[PDB]
Amino acid sequence: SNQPLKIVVPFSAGGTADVLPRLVAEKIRADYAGGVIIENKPGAGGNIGADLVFRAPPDGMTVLASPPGPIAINHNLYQKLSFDPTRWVPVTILATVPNVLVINPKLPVKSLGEFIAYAKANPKKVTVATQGDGSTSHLTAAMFMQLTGTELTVIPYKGTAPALIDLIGGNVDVFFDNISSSATYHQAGKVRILAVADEQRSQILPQVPTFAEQQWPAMQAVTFFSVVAPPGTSAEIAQKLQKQMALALSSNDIRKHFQEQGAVPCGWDPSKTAQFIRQETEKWKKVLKAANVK
Ligand SMILES: O=C(O)c1ccc(C(=O)O)cc1
């Protein structure tokens, strides 16, 4: 078709939600006469761009590349959504990535223990950025507060990218971002990452310990980036698109870029993708209850 493939990322450009489909989009451009364009449609925790793709023609030329918010979390948190995430047509999972605790380095804090005490001394004073209500950074922050007894004031953003800008600029204190987008700044000293919310360390930040190592093993928060087609999209179209992307994800160049920012390439078929989204939808639903989020 002379039309381009429209991949909608419902978060600000500059974060992991943007860069992973963008890297893959470049590899699959030869598959489409009209090309492959990324469209950034941020706002409302990813629901604006999500609603946009949800209403798009089910022809497989408009798709949503999104982290879990609009995919597996928002419908169990928001009072009413204009779309039903259980009706997405799964294409594939691009990658899973662990979340980490990022702080502004100018805070008088160099460890988790110091941070917890620093927040407990003044409840509500320490501000925590999020990528929007229902994002994993939101639920990971709430998860953290439940386990530690700290009280952080949530500040939502249209994505990781504007949140990091403010964090580095001293306008927001902490951020439970995913490691991929924050590691770039940690190496340059622009931020300080205190811990990884995963069972193993990440090899891009070998010195940053897991929460579990720091004796907070209940801090387990791994996000994932999915590709979904509008409701009604045929299984053939979704499968042909997942194969195109699975081919991209298997190349050395993409594996290298993914590996180097701590992203784990997946590329599963739509059926395994569908199961995984069910498993994750259930996982985060329990986090919603256990930390009662809002
Ligand atoms: O919900 C998440 O985990 C998530 C949200 C936004 C972004 C981004 O703005 O790149 C990345 C991850």
Residue numbers in the entry: 28 to 321
What wording appears in the published article?
In this study, we characterised the TphC SBP that is a key component in the cellular uptake of TPA, the breakdown product of PET plastic. TphC belongs to the TTT family in Commamonas sp. strain E6 and through biochemical and structural analysis, the ligand-binding properties and 3D structure were determined in both open and ligand-bound closed forms. As with the tripartite ATP-independent periplasmic (TRAP) class of SBP-dependent transporters, they are symporter proteins driven by an electrochemical ion-gradient, rather than ATP as per the SBP-dependent class of ABC transporters. Here, we report the biochemical and structural characterisation of TphC in both open and TPA-bound closed conformations. This analysis demonstrates the narrow ligand specificity of TphC towards aromatic para-substituted dicarboxylates, such as TPA and closely related analogues.
Purified TphC was readily co-crystallised in the presence of 2 mM TPA and crystals diffracted to 2.4 Å resolution. The general architecture of the previously reported TTT-SBPs is maintained in the TphC–TPA structure. Superposition of the open and closed TphC structures highlights an ~36° closure between the two domains upon TPA binding. Upon closure the solvent accessible surface area of TphC decreases from 13,048 to 12,495 Å2 encapsulating a closed cavity of 280 Å3 in which the TPA is bound. The bound TPA is recognised through a number of direct and water-mediated hydrogen bond interactions. The TPA carboxylate group buried deepest within the pocket is recognised and stabilised through direct (T155, T242) and water-mediated hydrogen bonds (T155, Q150, N197). The second carboxyl group of the TPA hydrogen bonds to the backbone amino groups of A36 and with additional water-mediated interactions with the backbones of G34, S31 and T179. The interactions at this second carboxylate group span between the two TphC domains stabilising the closed conformation. The binding pocket is bordered on one side by a conserved aromatic residue (F30); the positioning of this sidechain is facilitated by the proximity of a conserved glycine (G178). Unlike other TTT-SBPs characterised to date, the ligand site of TphC contains bulky amino acids P86 and Q150, the sidechains of which create a very narrow pocket 6.4 Å across, which would appear to confer the observed selectivity toward planar aromatic ligands.
